[PDB]
Amino acid sequence: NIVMTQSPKSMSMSVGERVTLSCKASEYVGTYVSWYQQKPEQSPKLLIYGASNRYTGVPDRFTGSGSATDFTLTIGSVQAEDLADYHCGQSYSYPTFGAGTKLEL
Amino acid sequence: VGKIWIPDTFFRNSKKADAHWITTPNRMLRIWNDGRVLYTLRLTIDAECQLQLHNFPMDEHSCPLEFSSYGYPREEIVYQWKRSSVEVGDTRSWRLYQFSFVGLRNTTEVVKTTSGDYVVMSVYFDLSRRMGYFTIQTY
Amino acid sequence: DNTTVFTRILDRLLDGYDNRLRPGLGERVTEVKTDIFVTSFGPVSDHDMEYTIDVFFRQSWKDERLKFKGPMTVLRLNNLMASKIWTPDTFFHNGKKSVAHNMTMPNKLLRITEDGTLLYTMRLTVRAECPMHLEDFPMDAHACPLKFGSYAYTRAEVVYEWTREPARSVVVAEDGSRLNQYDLLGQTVDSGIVQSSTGEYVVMTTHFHLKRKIGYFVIQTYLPCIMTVILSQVSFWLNRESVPARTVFGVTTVLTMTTLSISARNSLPKVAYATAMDWFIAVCYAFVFSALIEFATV
Amino acid sequence: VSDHDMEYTIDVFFRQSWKDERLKFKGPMTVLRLNNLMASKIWTPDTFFHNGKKSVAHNMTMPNKLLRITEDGTLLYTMRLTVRAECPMHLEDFPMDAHACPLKFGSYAYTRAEVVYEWTREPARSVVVAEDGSRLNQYDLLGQTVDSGIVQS
Amino acid sequence: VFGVTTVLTMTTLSISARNSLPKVAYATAMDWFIAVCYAFVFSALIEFATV
Amino acid sequence: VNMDYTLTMYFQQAWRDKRLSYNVIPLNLTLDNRVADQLWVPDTYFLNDKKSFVHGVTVKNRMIRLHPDGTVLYGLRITTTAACMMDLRRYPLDEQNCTLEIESYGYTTDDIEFYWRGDDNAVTGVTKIELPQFSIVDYKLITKKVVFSTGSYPRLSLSFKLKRNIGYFILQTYMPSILITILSWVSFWINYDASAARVALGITTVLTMTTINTHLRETLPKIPYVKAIDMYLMGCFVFVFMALLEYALVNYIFFSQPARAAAIDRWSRIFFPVVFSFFNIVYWLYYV
Amino acid sequence: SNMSLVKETVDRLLKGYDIRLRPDFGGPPVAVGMNIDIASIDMVSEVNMDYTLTMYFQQAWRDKRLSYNVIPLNLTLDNRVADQLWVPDTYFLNDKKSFVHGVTVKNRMIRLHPDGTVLYGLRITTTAACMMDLRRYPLDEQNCTLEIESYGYTTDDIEFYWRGDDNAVTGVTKIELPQFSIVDYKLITKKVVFSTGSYPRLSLSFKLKRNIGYFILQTYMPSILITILSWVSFWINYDASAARVALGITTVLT
Amino acid sequence: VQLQQSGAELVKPGASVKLSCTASGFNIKDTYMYWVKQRPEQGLEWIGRIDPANGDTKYDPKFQGKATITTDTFSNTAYLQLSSLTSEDTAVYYCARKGLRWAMDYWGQGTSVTVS
Ligand SMILES: *[C@@H]1O[C@H](CO)[C@@H](O[C@@H]2O[C@H](CO)[C@@H](O[C@@H]3O[C@H](CO[C@H]4O[C@H](CO[C@H]5O[C@H](CO)[C@@H](O)[C@H](O)[C@@H]5O[C@H]5O[C@H](CO)[C@@H](O)[C@H](O)[C@@H]5O)[C@@H](O)[C@H](O[C@H]5O[C@H](CO)[C@@H](O)[C@H](O)[C@@H]5O)[C@@H]4O)[C@@H](O)[C@H](O[C@H]4O[C@H](CO)[C@@H](O)[C@H](O)[C@@H]4O[C@H]4O[C@H](CO)[C@@H](O)[C@H](O)[C@@H]4O[C@H]4O[C@H](CO)[C@@H](O)[C@H](O)[C@@H]4O)[C@@H]3O)[C@H](O)[C@H]2NC(C)=O)[C@H](O)[C@H]1NC(C)=O
Ligand SMILES: *[C@@H]1O[C@H](CO)[C@@H](O[C@@H]2O[C@H](CO)[C@@H](OC3O[C@H](CO)[C@@H](O)[C@H](O)[C@@H]3O)[C@H](O)[C@H]2NC(C)=O)[C@H](O)[C@H]1NC(C)=O
Ligand SMILES: *[C@@H]1O[C@H](CO)[C@@H](O[C@@H]2O[C@H](CO)[C@@H](O[C@H]3O[C@H](CO)[C@@H](O)[C@H](O)[C@@H]3O)[C@H](O)[C@H]2NC(C)=O)[C@H](O)[C@H]1NC(C)=O
Ligand SMILES: *[C@@H]1O[C@H](CO)[C@@H](O[C@@H]2O[C@H](CO)[C@@H](O[C@H]3O[C@H](CO)[C@@H](O)[C@H](O)[C@@H]3O)[C@H](O)[C@H]2NC(C)=O)[C@H](O)[C@H]1NC(C)=O
Ligand SMILES: *[C@@H]1O[C@H](CO)[C@@H](O[C@@H]2O[C@H](CO)[C@@H](O)[C@H](O)[C@H]2NC(C)=O)[C@H](O)[C@H]1NC(C)=O
Ligand SMILES: *[C@@H]1O[C@H](CO)[C@@H](O)[C@H](O)[C@H]1NC(C)=O
Ligand SMILES: *[C@@H]1O[C@H](CO)[C@@H](O)[C@H](O)[C@H]1NC(C)=O
Which of A10, C72, C266, G23: disulfide with G63, CB 3.0–4.6 Å? Predict the structure, then answer.
């Protein structure tokens, strides 16, 4: 059972700057890590698939960077509607997600 | 050749055998006035013969090249040698380094197979090993 | 008239069918679901930097033109119906000389499901390239790759996918190991986008992790080298009033070091760097030479 | 030249030319430089090498063949192929020996009263070896020598 | 040791030189050269034995 | 070295197709082999083969025969290079068991069914095989079903138990090692005065062991386990090495007291063939 | 809809299409542009005097008969329609054995364009023969070339050129050889003259400098060590003869 | 294109519930269907997986034997049946569709299951 450790659990920041989220795997997950965004009392929406692949309907300010174990999601020039929970989930094996990451302004 | 009936002759003791295709398939067909068909083709066979390697290198072998039909048994296809069956060329331009051709003999037989009785024809080439290489190599 | 209905189904199925056009040529992207069952992991050649593998290669996709309705729900067809339909043109990016077996008939499998889904399986032997780094020879671990994708169909036309979870797609049999010198540790799949002079293509990568076994090179080379070094060091306990004895000792062990080294160079390829066995042989040769010069000094 | 097999290899453009009165035409072009798939629909001579062992006819990328038809009916037919021919050697003076490796070709299936061969230019100038055309490491090509004869089979 | 190791050298030379020529069943010029050289080496060793 | 074997076979398949049934002529119909491309023939394959082919002189070597009740008889002449992994831990006193797998590729076990025609006599010509290095001891025919991710398939398996002969290996490999060990023992009959003689003899016996080791290593694959011949060669090498080391130890204490010189000399003379024969007996009783 | 439209378009393209004739058969020559993506240069053999290379070999020309305007996109067709189009009879003059890879199908690519342009790629592993000058082996630098020529069509029927003329051959800097190192490569356009006509030719040359570390540690160091070893014959006193004889003769034997 | 789940409801401790997920815009026999569970202000946790074309399923070892996922291709629906419920099952359950490099691109609306 591949475990995903996401960091950090929370982040406070203003509007407009660059932010970075990290995700780490226990075993090997070769570019099969997805990034989801879930607003409060809603269903998760796919942002990034593969390791660096923007989903059709997502802005260009989200970008993924992948490896065999260390993955990250960087958002440059954030807006006022990018506050939500963010989950990293692997799919190399049976899917397991990370603990989450709240993002507040 | 591929438009009329051609017998399914195959060499029973061949490990590898190929015809010749350069520059055009080296085959010949001749049909006569009374229906007699003659079909000739050039072949290079890698036949197998178990060599009893006792008395080596002062040994003599006689190991065959056999052929028969593949699908047609004795009741459907019968083979038969001519009065001038096997003809060798000059015998000196041959690639026999360690051996020396001494003669040949033809043979016909019937062999039991799971599919039926087949008329098998054999050509035994008699070879004798010339001790000109093993002499200066080992003796 | 029990097989006339199937002949009619197969005739109607291919009547109006262009096997030059992929399903969804200007409408959609063809999604191919791949699966690999390794029936034997063949020998890994270290002098050619290659390896052999024997696989059942399965590809599934969906063609809306091959929908039918009959007394059967799946048509398990021959290997000659696959040449009358569109099949993906998968090639191996790092293959050297692969073979698709056709003994006694083409080892291919075609199954059409009534909703339009096709399963197409082949049995083939792939001889692929494995670029190796032999610094730590013969205590080296490699990841021999196997990359495949589509020839001529870019990412906007044909995309590949695993049929099961990626950790469970490339499956190696248990008795399927023709490795004499290595040890297959595990497998590792991957997916990416390569870019060539004709566009961007999807590439499905598999890595087989091999760990060389040292038990042969130990007994073959490492123990004779240590034995020759010990046999050279034996000479230090002989009395100096006997010079021919220690002389033939030293020079003949140097000659044996030469014989073992010449024998020893046929194992590994003609790499331009020093391996670990090369360092061991060099240090042992140095010890033998040092012993002889020490005898010369005494 | 493989001494261990008593054979040699040779890469050639093999050109043949004959006259076929059934392939006369009259068009704007005076020579049709056609494909290598038109030569299978027409008659071509069935030349084989009498001492060839295992020859190849190159098929990369297309069949390396050439067919040209002139308006008056003459056909030029060229192939590129690698002959692996047999050279019987008398190695009594090895390694100070000289050899004459032959290359005999003729017609299979066509006797002398049906198909005859001849060199298209002067016999001394028909077989032409290129200057940089030498993969010999152990020998030295000194010259060529052609001949024509009849064998009774 | 001169004579016997020279004989060893001639044998390994003849072995390495016999593997070059194809396996013909007669004597070539190199075979005669190696035979006469072996004869000379053996003659040197027998001469030493006589001395 | 390739971990495979090559076999030529006449491979025949018999099934019954009711569409190829006729009753107007009373004879069996052997047809030209080109009609096998116009009939349904099963898609039999060999799972453990590496390079196969049907012979093609003078025509494609295959047979197609129709019987009036619908029975189709379809024969091929195949030269298969099948693959079998060998356990060479007892080389050359080993017995190798490798099999040829016969399966149907496309058709599952609910579409086709395999069996041996005769069930004991379906495979002939095994008692006439003369292998130069092995000898067929037994052969077996097995019928089973295998399960793959695409379905269940019938499988037949023809297996030949081979036993390696020893007549070649003794005279070419084991006698040189034994004679080098005896010829290394021979220096004990040389007195302790001639140091150069015993040193040269011991080291040159070691050298013979190395040259034979190379001339043996030029023949086999690179297997990590130790073979029986590797154990015997290492035992012989260790015995020659111990004889030379024993000479060194009897040359060291020789000046301080000459009694130990003759003691160890005679002791080695009597007890080295004894321990070597003991090891030899243990080896030939463990492997044979 | 969108599938049967392309089906009728391709059927219209291939109806009344003469494969025996090149584009503009009785007119100006057709230009063919070449691209090569070298995948690997496998084994440079000195004993066989050849070198194997795998490449993606692509040809591009324009066929005015394969021109369509019903659909606006480019057409990648099944690789078996290249047996029904005209493709140039390109060959390699110096090869010994070559093949198109045929796994899982014949590794070739056909691609059409609405104006008539055809792109035709193959994946070829070829064993090209290059004679080496080994007078300085192993401190040598070998230059061998691959000739790309037209067999049937002369220089007044076909024209060869590198598509890009400097970036036509890619993948050379990622090639790793066990013994050599690609120092430079060159592209050449040319016309050769035979007794049958004048033919266009392209030539790809790879200058390979051989590495030295392998040969140093494998052959040059043992010989230097044996010659150093043969110098211990002077340090032994000239009275003891057997030692010096054994030493010197064993160095000669080694 | 769309995944429609059932409505939120209550359940007594020790009973069994069957949640449904109706797909519209695609055929469930093409992709895999995942069931994911999310607790309030916690991370997502994967329950199980069903392959509607074949019928074989996999479950998380934590949910092995407790949940059973089934499908119905006629109505294009996927069902999750939970048995032997406890108080720590009060969560939001999502029905997801596999696609585009194993990403779970399309999710449902989520049903709130509460245990009183
Ligand atoms: C697994 O798959 C394998 C690969 O697919 C497969 O191997 C293939 O086997 C098949 C069938 O056995 C082979 O197909 C046949 O090959 C015969 C010759 O085989 C030799 O040569 C081929 C290469 O063939 C080229 O050259 C020959 C002779 O010149 C041609 O006849 C071929 O068409 C082809 O021609 C082109 O390519 C040339 C360059 O190579 C060009 O120069 C030329 O311009 C052409 O473009 C070699 O590959 C073979 O080597 C291998 O096979 C041998 C077998 O002995 C092995 O021993 C060896 O180890 C190798 O593995 C071999 O050397 C062809 O003669 C044959 O063509 C005829 O028969 C077929 C089938 O019936 C007909 O459909 C076809 O129409 C031909 O018939 C016409 O001509 C014959 C002449 O005898 C007439 O009798 C007949 O009546 C008919 O006449 C008519 O048409 C003529 C024009 O065609 C016309 O002139 C007449 O007027 C008349 O109208 C056939 O192609 C195939 O080559 C093998 N492929 C390979 C690569 O191995 C294997 O079988 C499969 N195994 C299983 C178990 O499934
Ligand atoms: C040498 O190269 C030529 C051309 O590259 C090869 O010819 C091709 O041969 C195919 C097999 O004979 C042939 O394929 C088929 O399609 C026709 C119908 O169009 C069928 O009737 C055949 O049975 C076969 O299924 C290709 O059409 C043909 N292509 C061309 C342009 O001629 C030839 O096989 C090569 N020779 C060798 C030995 O590999
Ligand atoms: C060579 O190795 C073969 C495979 O290891 C081996 O085959 C094994 O043979 C036995 C019988 O000889 C088979 O069977 C038994 O299993 C069946 C299963 O239904 C039982 O009904 C029988 O009572 C019996 O217990 C094995 O199935 C078979 N193994 C495999 C994997 O096929 C050969 O016997 C070995 N020896 C020779 C000489 O070939
Ligand atoms: C490897 O060997 C090649 C062949 O020997 C060699 O190619 C030669 O390269 C030069 C420079 O590119 C060519 O040309 C010059 O001559 C032409 C004649 O028209 C001029 O137009 C050019 O401007 C220049 O003066 C030669 O024609 C060419 N020779 C052949 C036979 O093709 C390579 O340079 C060698 N080296 C490398 C690194 O590839
Ligand atoms: C080869 O076969 C032919 C035919 O079988 C043999 O010719 C026969 O020879 C005998 C004398 O030994 C004659 O009496 C027969 O009339 C011949 N038969 C025919 C029809 O030719 C010939 O002897 C055989 N040659 C051998 C055995 O090498
Ligand atoms: C046809 O073959 C069968 C079995 O091989 C045999 O019993 C039968 O007698 C044969 N028919 C004739 C007419 O010989
Ligand atoms: C077709 O290819 C050309 C060049 O490769 C490209 O410029 C063009 O955009 C392509 N057509 C379409 C519809 O993308």
Answer: G23
Inter-residue contact C108 to C121 (CB < 8 Å): yes
What's the gap in Å between H2 CA and the centre of ligand 7?
Answer: 34
Contact A46, H103 (CB under 8 A): yes
Instruction: Find the residue in C nearest to G228 (Cα).
Output: C289
What single DSSP character describes residue G22? -
> Which residue in chain G is spatially nearest to D17 when comparing CA positions?
G196
Helices (H) and strands (E) in chain H, counts: 0, 10
Inter-residue contact H18 to H80 (CB < 8 Å) = yes
CB distance F30 to ligand 6 below 6 Å: no
| Contacts C188 to A, Cβ<8 Å | 28, 30
Dihedral pair phi/psi, residue E16, rounded to 5°: -70, -25
Whether the Cβ atoms of residue H18 and residue H27 lie closer than 8 Å to each other:
no
Query: Cα(G94)–Cα(G146) distance, rounded to whole angstroms?
Result: 6
Residue C101: what residue type?
H
Vertex G207 angle, CA G206 and G209, to 5°: 135
> Is C60 within 8 Å of chain F by CB?
no
CA dist C30 and C149 (Å) reads: 13
**CA distances to C189, D102, D142 from D139, in Å:** 53, 15, 9
Reference C278, options C142, C130, C181, C138; nearest CA is C138
From C49, C254, C278, residue closest to G229, measured CB to CB: C254
The SS3 assignment for F169 reads: helix
C-beta atoms of G245 and E8 within 8 A: no
CA F163 to chain centre: 7
Please give the Cα distance from F288 to B31 (Å, whole number).
Answer: 66
CA distance C144 to C45: 11
- Give nearest CA residue, ligand 3 atom 7: F142
Assess whether C134 and C224 both reside in one domain.
no
Q: Which residue has the tokens 């069930």?
A: F119
Which helix (H) or strand (E) segment holds residue G227: the answer is: helix G221-229
Bridge partners of F98, per DSSP, are F160
Strands F49-54, F44-46: parallel, antiparallel or unpaired by DSSP? unpaired
Please say whether the beta carbons of D19 and D51 come within 8 A.
no
Determine contact, residues H85/H42, Cβ cutoff 8 Å. Answer: no
Q: What range defines the domain where residue C80 resides?
A: 1-213
Residue type, C267: S
Overall domain count for chain H: 1
Q: Distance between CA atoms of C144 and C157, rounded to whole angstroms?
A: 29
d(CA C176, CA C167): 18
Lookup: tokens for B110 = 């019937």
Q: What is the resolution of this structure in A?
A: 2.9
The minimal CB distance from F58 to the residues B5, B41, B71 is found for B41
Centroid of chain to Cα A67: 14
Whether the bond between D95 and the residue before it is cis, its omega within 30 degrees of 0, is: yes
End-to-end CA distance of chain H: 34
* Facing H101 at nearest CB: one of A36, A49, A87: A49
Please state whether beta strands G30-45 and G169-170 pair in parallel, antiparallel, or not at all (unpaired). parallel
- DSSP 3-state assignment of D103? coil
Q: Best mutation site among F53, F57, F74, F78 for ligand 1, i.e. most ligand atoms within 8 A of its Cβ?
A: F53
Contact B52, B24 (CB under 8 A): no
CA–centroid distance, residue B105 to ligand 5 (Å): 10
**Residue F213: closest CA among C229, C228, G217:** C228
Joined tokens for residue G39: 């995948």
Q: C170 and C122 in one domain?
A: yes
Contact between A79 and A72 under an 8 Å Cβ cutoff? The reply is no
Same domain, C176 and C237: no
Q: How many domains does chain C have?
A: 2
Both C94 and C17 in one domain: the answer is yes
**In terms of domains, do C218 and C131 share one?**
no
The last residue of one of the domains, among C213, C236, C262, is: C213
